[PDB]
């Protein structure tokens with residue numbers, strides 16, 4: 551069989567479940583695809599650069615996760631699709647000797663959501679894609695962080711940006727904190743409790759464990775959701791791109807969800 555290599559770049563990367571779900575898809579769709587893909591986790595040092603490694607490893611495609619999504623937007627050769635407005639790339643595909651960047655987090659998030667406004671905690675690649683998607687949907691979006699990082703990007707989208715927690719009710723409260731595993735509460739406990747009591751959904755991008763952020767929502771009987779569904783939808787969308795759009799995301803999603 552013709553073989554193709556794929557991977558996920560991140561730091562850390564041990565917890566990624568992308569290899570498990572992508573490999574299940576490559577194994578079954580090799581008949582329709584006429585090639586056998588294999589997907590591996592790739593721990594990249596914080597300063598090494600993505601493009602050199604992508605090419606050296608001979609990859610046909612890759613995902614990018616924390617803390618490299620903004621860098622991926624900068625180093626890819628061409629940005630296509632909604633990524634153009636996300637300031638972040640989580641999917642790389644080698645197309646006619648160009649490293650092309652896409653963003654499947656935006657739509658993956660949308661599809662994961664079964665709301666009028668949202669508060670996003672975070673300023674990295676994930677937060678950026680989510681802000682882009684939520685503004686596109688017609689929600690009011692507030693972004694809360696500890697510094698002015700990413701201010702230009704979020705303000706140009708039309709988001710309200712804060713460093714002090716805004717005294718407002720939010721339908722969605724989203725933990726998209728950057729370069730973090732989400733083991734800790736991202737805000738003061740009482741501040742979170744206040745938001746959760748007036749909120750409709752507490753959403754955390756972390757998956758594989760119940761984050762303290764989600765636990766607080768659970769304890770308060772506020773609806774909550776971790777990042778599993780988003781992971782699977784964004785992965786299925788990436789797989790569609792890895793297949794050169796021959797396998798639609800709906801088909802990859804079914805296989806991926808089952809194996810996860």
Ligand SMILES: O=C(O)C1=C[C@@H](O)[C@@H](O)[C@H](O)C1
Pocket residue numbers: 558565566567568569613614615616640641655781784
């Ligand atoms: O944990 C993972 O494997 C991933 C998580 C998200 O950041 C995704 O955007 C990324 O493509 C893969």
